[PDB]
């Protein structure tokens, strides 16, 4: 899809095999923010959002937090606290025509900057002068979308690039998108090194009488450490008590 009408896909309730992605070498750009690729396969997420569009190489640097430009300001803006990955690859062999591929558009004028993850597909005539426009193109009255060139003989800065922006919402909640990691059996009343939906630690896992609400996944103590977890396979609440200790 065109960058002004970037397509969003919702990924939920599936095992996410991120190995293929960072192991494939087709991608020209692969940069992650808030998390590292190596530590991604062993991590769960509440939801994953895949936003996909096409831009040119000059504008690839704008797909990042804290960036400015036509794409960042008027087409697709990422928040300053973005937690996800940006993947891009050159699609000159696919998104270019001998007469110029004019199907990919981008927004050129807008009265204000887009909020993060905002999608504007309005085609209202932009009023750039004092005279009001009555919906008709003309003098100081702009059509807000411009068409990309995209020709096989274009310079690399102007060749097409397909971009995918994976956004992760790490909020502590029931997970549906977990990595390709096999589970093990659970041992109660013993000091173990546990990993519950990507949350790791050391402690004794015991039975509890803490009535978690259907939307609650983790409990916390005053120190903000994990107090209890809900087993992702059997919906019971287990208390986590740090393994015994004391001064010597």
């Amino acid at each position, epitope marked *: 899809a065109s960058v002004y009408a970037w397509n969003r896909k919702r990924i939920s309730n599936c095992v996410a095999d991120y190995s293929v992605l960072y192991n494939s070498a087709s991608f020209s750009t692969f940069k992650c923010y808030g998390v590292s690729p190596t530590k991604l396969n062993d991590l769960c997420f509440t939801n994953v959002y895949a936003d996909s569009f096409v831009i040119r190489g000059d504008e690839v640097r704008q797909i990042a937090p804290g960036q400015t430009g036509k794409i960042a300001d008027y087409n697709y803006k990422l928040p300053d606290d973005f937690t996800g990955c940006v993947i891009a690859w050159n699609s000159n062999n696919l998104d270019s025509k001998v*007469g110029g591929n*004019y199907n990919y558009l981008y927004r050129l004028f807008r009265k204000s900057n887009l909020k993060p993850f905002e999608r504007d597909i309005s*085609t209202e005539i932009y009023q*750039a002068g004092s*005279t009001p*426009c*009555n919906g*008709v*193109e*003309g*003098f*100081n*009255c702009y*059509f807000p*979308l411009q*068409s990309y060139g995209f020709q096989p003989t274009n310079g690399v800065g102007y060749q097409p690039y397909r971009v995918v922006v994976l956004s992760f919402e790490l909020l502590h909640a029931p997970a549906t998108v977990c990595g390709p990691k096999k589970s093990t059996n659970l041992v109660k009343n013993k000091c173990v090194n546990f990993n519950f939906n990507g949350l790791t630690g050391t402690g004794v896992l015991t039975e509890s009488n803490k009535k978690f609400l259907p939307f609650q996944q983790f409990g916390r103590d005053i120190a903000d450490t994990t107090d209890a977890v809900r087993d992702p396979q059997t919906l019971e609440i287990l208390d986590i008590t740090p393994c015994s200790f004391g001064g010597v």
Partner: antibody
Amino acid sequence: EVQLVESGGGLVKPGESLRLSCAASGFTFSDYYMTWIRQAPGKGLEWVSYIRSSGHTIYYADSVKGRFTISRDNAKNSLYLQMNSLRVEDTAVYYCARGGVLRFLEWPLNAFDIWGQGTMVTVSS
Amino acid sequence: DIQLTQSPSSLSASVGDRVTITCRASQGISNYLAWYQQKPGKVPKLLIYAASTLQSGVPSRFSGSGSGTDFTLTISSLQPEDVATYYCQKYNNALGTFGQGTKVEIKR
């Protein structure tokens, strides 16, 4: 040779449909916006329709809104006008005219300098 | 929509006389105005564009002036082959509206 050649005029009964063609030569047709302008017998010039350089904006005179459709095929270097629900008052000589080259932050002052030869449309029983 | 008013409707003059046609725009159209000559039953011929720029091939006795809402076409020395109807057209936006036209007759 820079020119516009029109075709498709003829005799039509009221309510029927007729499609006009305008073939462009000698210039980059995809760089210009096109217009249709008609002139009824013994009457003045009337602007009919407008299509953008690549057709992302389209405008029609109120007398033809909902019944006329303007379109272009930049690859075929051609402009079309599909006229449905024709009326008797639609009888006129129709011209296609190339506008100007839309550039960045500039409405073109060089426009409407090349017209077709005209084609006659007569709507009658 | 901006309307164009042409004046006069009809006029008869003599060869060599100066002819002045006025085009009035209901709202400002900057200098996006053009002047056409149309001989009877013929394709309109562009004479002036950009309110004051003479089209190539047009005789230098034609001239255009004006800006905003008042525009005037001037034929310094009327000639026998100038008998036609003259139209003004705005093109400040996509609505290329025309005027009603001014028929120029010649007294002999």
